[PDB]
Amino acid sequence: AQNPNCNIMIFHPTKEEFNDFDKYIAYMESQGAHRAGLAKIIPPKEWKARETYDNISEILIATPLQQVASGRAGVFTQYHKKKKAMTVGEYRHLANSKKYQTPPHQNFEDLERKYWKNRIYNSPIYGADISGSLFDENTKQWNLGHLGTIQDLLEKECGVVIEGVNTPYLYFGMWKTTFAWHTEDMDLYSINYLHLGEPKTWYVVPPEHGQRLERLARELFPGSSRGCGAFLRHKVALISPTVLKENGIPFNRITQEAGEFMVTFPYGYHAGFNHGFNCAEAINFATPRWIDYGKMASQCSCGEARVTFSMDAFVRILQPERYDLWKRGQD
């Protein structure tokens, strides 16, 4: 069995191996990459996402979110307070202001310590889930706006044509902006490209140990758990690496830098934070191996998680028994 310790693997494809996305994902899985829940892919040196980032300041962040924490330093929830619209240029200036900028630090490990010690005491502002792309239309390899759609994958594997579309989203971050512990909708893959700026630190639980995380989460967030059998789908709960180690939860950590891709695998719980001003692009995707995870994915039916239009069909076709209840939560 390849990668039995479930370590995060790092790949360095050649330009020739970068030509066929599906084939390269399947190659990574033949080496056991999926067992970690997360892999890093460093693109060939010949590749570029686009020519420059000099013309992005007029993108609009229509609903910036202020991430307000409650709890203790190692175990907290965050809610997202809506703020007034601002451009990327305005957001970048805000991120670099004395109130929000990255503090002085020695290395990534010192910054991580500072994050976990101090995150709850501040409320950073995040631009999330902005539909759009920064890949040049003439970038032909690993262009996240030109990947095969999940609806086409389901049709190829299962024979059923469904409505829906699958497009990329941009994320503008600053110091301390945080992504809570979650798996992807319908336990999909994700791919994330860090276009520019400061790094992003990731934590991940191996898929084969996901239920261990879930059990801890129900203990640490007992009211939320009573409210919803799938409350991590609300994307609000944070648990530090010190708390995870204290509770014997298997996990790994890695820092992504600008110019690097990360892939999350089906049912790989992950969380993390941004080091400073940055811009990432991400999209969900599927492979044949995903189908069986889609059929088993939990779902939020309490009303909180409220998701994309296109998730309807996945629930309807892969989880017909759950469909009725889930849809009542969406209406």
Ligand X SMILES: O=C(O)CNC(=O)C(=O)O
Annotated binding site: 126, 182, 184, 192, 200, 228, 234-235, 270, 300, 302
Helix (H, G, I), strand (E, B) or coil at 229: coil
Pick what 300 binds: Zn ion, ligand X, Mg ion, none; C-beta below 5 to 8 Å, kind-dependent: Zn ion
Q: Which is nearer to Zn ion, 204 or 228 (CB)?
A: 228
- Number of residues interacting with Zn ion: please give it, by CB under 5 A: 4
Using an 8 Å Cβ cutoff, are 61 and 172 in contact? yes
Site of interaction with ligand X (CB under 6 A):
171, 179, 190, 192, 264, 270, 280, 282
For residue 300, state whether it binds Zn ion (rule: CB under 5 A). Answer: yes
Helix or strand (DSSP H, E) at 181: strand 178-182
With CB under 5 A as the contact rule, the residue among 228, 232, 249, 315 that binds Zn ion is: 228
Q: Is 54 in the site for Mg ion (CB under 5 A)?
A: no
CB neighbour list of residue 72: distance below 8 Å, 6 or more residues apart: 120
**Contact call for residues 118 and 94 (beta carbons, < 8 A):** no
Bridge partners (DSSP) listed for residue 66: 81, 125
Q: Tell me which stretch binds Mg ion (CB under 5 A): 48-56, 163-171, 214-222, 259-267.
A: 48-56
Of 60, 302, 313, 317, the one binding Zn ion by CB under 5 A: 302
CB of 262 to ligand X, least distance (A): 7
Q: Does 307 bind Zn ion (CB under 5 A)?
A: no
Torsion region of 113: left, alpha or beta (phi above 0 gives left; psi -120 to 50 gives alpha): alpha
Among the candidate windows 83-91, 108-116, 191-199, 223-231, which touches Zn ion by CB under 5 A? 223-231
Which of Mg ion, Zn ion, ligand X, none sits in contact with 302, Cβ below 5 to 8 A by type?
A: Zn ion
Q: Is 16 exposed, middle or buried (0-12, 13-18, 19+ CB in 10 A)?
A: exposed
Token readout for 227 is 């409210």
In the chain, which ranges are continuous DSSP H helix? 21-30, 88-95, 108-118, 150-158, 210-220, 222-227, 241-246, 291-296, 311-318, 320-330
State the distance between the two ends of the chain, measured CA to CA, in whole angstroms. Answer: 44
Rounded-to-integer distance, Cα 329 and Cα 309, Å: 13
Q: Which of residues 86-105 bind Mg ion (CB under 5 A)?
A: none
* Closer residue to ligand X, CB minimum distance, 171 or 221: 171
With CB cut-offs between 5 and 8 Å by kind, which of ligand X, Mg ion, Zn ion, none does residue 58 bind?
A: Mg ion
Residues in contact with Mg ion by the rule CB under 5 A: 56, 58
Residues in contact with Zn ion by the rule CB under 5 A: 228, 300, 302, 304
